[PDB]
Design an enzyme around this catalytic site. Structure first.
Site, mmCIF file in Angstrom:
data_model
loop_
_atom_site.group_PDB
_atom_site.id
_atom_site.type_symbol
_atom_site.label_atom_id
_atom_site.label_comp_id
_atom_site.label_asym_id
_atom_site.label_seq_id
_atom_site.Cartn_x
_atom_site.Cartn_y
_atom_site.Cartn_z
ATOM 1 N N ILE A 16 32.353 44.020 35.198
ATOM 2 C CA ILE A 16 31.145 43.442 34.666
ATOM 3 C C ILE A 16 30.222 44.567 34.699
ATOM 4 O O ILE A 16 29.084 44.572 33.658
ATOM 5 C CB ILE A 16 30.731 42.015 34.988
ATOM 6 C CG1 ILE A 16 31.204 41.839 36.386
ATOM 7 C CG2 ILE A 16 31.730 41.230 34.357
ATOM 8 C CD1 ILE A 16 30.961 40.446 36.717
ATOM 9 N N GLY A 17 30.157 45.174 35.842
ATOM 10 C CA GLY A 17 28.923 46.136 35.945
ATOM 11 C C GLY A 17 29.423 47.262 36.632
ATOM 12 O O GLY A 17 30.554 47.460 37.172
ATOM 13 N N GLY A 19 26.963 50.356 38.151
ATOM 14 C CA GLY A 19 25.844 51.490 38.767
ATOM 15 C C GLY A 19 26.412 52.771 39.146
ATOM 16 O O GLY A 19 27.501 52.782 38.773
ATOM 17 N N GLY A 20 25.528 53.506 39.841
ATOM 18 C CA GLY A 20 26.073 54.986 40.302
ATOM 19 C C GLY A 20 27.441 54.951 40.824
ATOM 20 O O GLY A 20 28.533 55.380 40.234
ATOM 21 N N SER A 21 27.539 54.558 42.263
ATOM 22 C CA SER A 21 28.868 54.444 42.930
ATOM 23 C C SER A 21 29.244 53.101 43.252
ATOM 24 O O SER A 21 29.872 52.813 44.243
ATOM 25 C CB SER A 21 28.738 55.305 44.181
ATOM 26 O OG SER A 21 27.842 54.481 45.010
ATOM 27 N N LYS A 23 30.458 49.079 41.459
ATOM 28 C CA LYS A 23 31.199 48.371 40.374
ATOM 29 C C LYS A 23 31.198 46.834 40.699
ATOM 30 O O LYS A 23 31.332 46.498 41.755
ATOM 31 C CB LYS A 23 32.516 48.674 40.132
ATOM 32 C CG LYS A 23 32.877 50.473 39.919
ATOM 33 C CD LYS A 23 34.307 50.833 40.045
ATOM 34 N N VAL A 24 30.885 46.082 39.712
ATOM 35 C CA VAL A 24 30.970 44.631 39.864
ATOM 36 C C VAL A 24 32.167 44.143 39.224
ATOM 37 O O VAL A 24 32.348 44.316 37.886
ATOM 38 C CB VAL A 24 29.734 43.641 39.440
ATOM 39 C CG1 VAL A 24 29.733 42.444 40.108
ATOM 40 C CG2 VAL A 24 28.451 44.678 39.606
ATOM 41 N N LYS A 38 30.831 42.607 44.294
ATOM 42 C CA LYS A 38 30.484 44.052 44.226
ATOM 43 C C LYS A 38 30.906 44.900 45.235
ATOM 44 O O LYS A 38 30.918 44.880 46.196
ATOM 45 C CB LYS A 38 28.721 44.063 44.250
ATOM 46 C CG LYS A 38 28.226 45.315 44.193
ATOM 47 C CD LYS A 38 26.751 45.205 43.758
ATOM 48 C CE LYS A 38 25.758 45.930 44.494
ATOM 49 N NZ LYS A 38 24.584 45.547 44.300
ATOM 50 N N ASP A 132 10.667 47.380 39.475
ATOM 51 C CA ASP A 132 11.114 47.557 38.155
ATOM 52 C C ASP A 132 11.879 46.385 37.497
ATOM 53 O O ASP A 132 13.190 46.424 37.408
ATOM 54 C CB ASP A 132 12.319 48.786 38.155
ATOM 55 C CG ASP A 132 12.950 49.184 36.715
ATOM 56 O OD1 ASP A 132 13.968 49.617 36.895
ATOM 57 O OD2 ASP A 132 12.156 49.299 35.817
HETATM 58 C C1 LIG Z 1 25.188 44.581 37.545
HETATM 59 C C2 LIG Z 1 25.346 43.038 37.174
HETATM 60 O O1 LIG Z 1 25.389 42.428 38.655
HETATM 61 C C3 LIG Z 1 26.017 41.227 38.652
HETATM 62 C C4 LIG Z 1 26.512 40.438 37.769
HETATM 63 C C5 LIG Z 1 27.057 39.275 37.875
HETATM 64 C C6 LIG Z 1 27.829 38.216 37.099
HETATM 65 C C7 LIG Z 1 28.011 38.676 35.687
HETATM 66 C C8 LIG Z 1 27.317 39.340 34.760
HETATM 67 C C9 LIG Z 1 27.460 39.470 33.477
HETATM 68 C C10 LIG Z 1 28.451 38.862 32.830
HETATM 69 C C11 LIG Z 1 29.032 39.126 31.407
HETATM 70 C C12 LIG Z 1 29.521 38.098 33.650
HETATM 71 S S1 LIG Z 1 30.825 37.231 33.318
HETATM 72 N N1 LIG Z 1 30.421 36.151 32.068
HETATM 73 O O2 LIG Z 1 31.352 36.402 34.366
HETATM 74 O O3 LIG Z 1 31.559 38.258 32.912
HETATM 75 C C13 LIG Z 1 29.163 37.832 35.074
HETATM 76 N N2 LIG Z 1 27.875 37.140 37.842
HETATM 77 N N3 LIG Z 1 27.500 37.324 39.053
HETATM 78 C C14 LIG Z 1 27.000 38.711 39.301
HETATM 79 C C15 LIG Z 1 26.409 39.458 40.306
HETATM 80 C C16 LIG Z 1 25.701 40.628 39.907
HETATM 81 C C17 LIG Z 1 25.217 41.370 41.188
HETATM 82 C C18 LIG Z 1 25.169 42.775 41.549
HETATM 83 N N4 LIG Z 1 24.485 42.810 42.575
HETATM 84 N N5 LIG Z 1 24.074 41.683 43.173
HETATM 85 C C19 LIG Z 1 23.140 41.909 44.253
HETATM 86 C C20 LIG Z 1 24.691 40.645 42.427
#
Ligand SMILES: CCOc1cc2c(-c3ccc(C)c(S(N)(=O)=O)c3)n[nH]c2cc1-c1cnn(C)c1
Length: 259
Positions: A16-17, A19-21, A23-24, A38, A132
């Protein structure tokens, strides 16, 4: 395909995500429950950034207790090589949702506003000023905006704009809780008028010109919700001293007067 975190196993269902190094991943435990995990690879990380990550984790943890408008951190693993953060899963980041929807419902937009206020209020109460701030930082989770990050650790992009930069952060180069008020204003402006204040301005070199410019005035067209129009005006005031506060915002009639 598979992530081990503090004993337990999760099956990667989608990225889903990224950043630099970092991945989510959208993942699933053995009982097939969803979670975001993450992964941060540390092989390249220098002490500044490494400390930033340790800092994010600690705050993210601490803040768990205080509010549910903050992304839930279930458990984590950290070695010299990697980080794994097992966290709550949502539907969509706000930014990718302000594109999709045509224009928002009044009752929802207010609800989302309360949500963000409580979130940002909480970090402020713990001496954090997220510099930011932007819709990409919020995450919808069964009718709730929750805050994903604190602007402490380096930002991740979900699978970078200057629409939300506050004046005082631009005028900076030769901070205040008020900075986040501006940015939240911009997000709410978007949710009422379908766009940010300066997102029609084309060149970025000059996008940051309109922001700082006192003579340049911002267009608040009238709407049925007179309270909302005031919040927008009070948030987007260029002088931090005369910009509304979060605690003021939490007593504003827009948040407070019923229907
Ligand atoms: C870069 C995006 O970061 C995150 C995204 C998510 C999401 C998430 C975001 C977008 C989508 C489209 C989805 S989805 N519908 O499950 O694919 C989940 N759930 N929990 C999340 C938790 C994080 C996250 C990343 N760092 N932290 C501290 C939380």
């Amino acid at each position: 395909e598979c992530i081990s975190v503090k004993g337990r196993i999760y099956s990667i269902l989608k990225q889903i995500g990224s950043g630099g190094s970092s991945k989510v991943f959208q993942v699933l435990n053995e009982k097939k429950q969803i979670y975001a995990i993450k992964y941060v690879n540390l092989e390249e990380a220098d002490n500044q950034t490494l400390d930033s990550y340790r800092n994010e984790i600690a705050y993210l943890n601490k803040l768990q207790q205080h509010s549910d408008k903050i992304i839930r951190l279930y458990d984590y693993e950290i070695t010299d090589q990697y980080i794994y953060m097992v966290m709550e899963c949502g539907n969509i980041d706000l930014n990718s949702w302000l594109k999709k929807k045509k224009s928002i419902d009044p009752w929802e937009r207010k609800s989302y506003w309360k949500n963000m206020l409580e979130a940002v209020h909480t970090i402020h109460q713990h001496g954090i000023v997220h510099s930011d701030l932007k819709p990409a930082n919020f995450l919808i989770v069964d009718g709730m905006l929750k805050l994903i990050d604190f602007g402490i650790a380096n930002q991740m992009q979900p699978d970078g704009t200057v629409n939300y930069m506050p004046p005082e952060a631009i005028k900076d180069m030769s901070i205040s809780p008020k900075s986040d008020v501006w940015s939240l204003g911009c997000i709410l402006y978007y949710m009422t008028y379908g766009k940010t204040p300066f997102q029609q301005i084309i060149n970025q070199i000059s996008k940051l010109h309109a922001i700082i410019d006192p003579n340049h005035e911002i267009e608040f067209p009238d709407i049925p919700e007179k309270d909302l129009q005031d919040v927008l005006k009070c948030c987007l005031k260029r002088d931090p001293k005369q910009r509304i506060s979060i605690p003021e915002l939490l007593a504003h009639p827009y948040v407070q007067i019923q229907t």
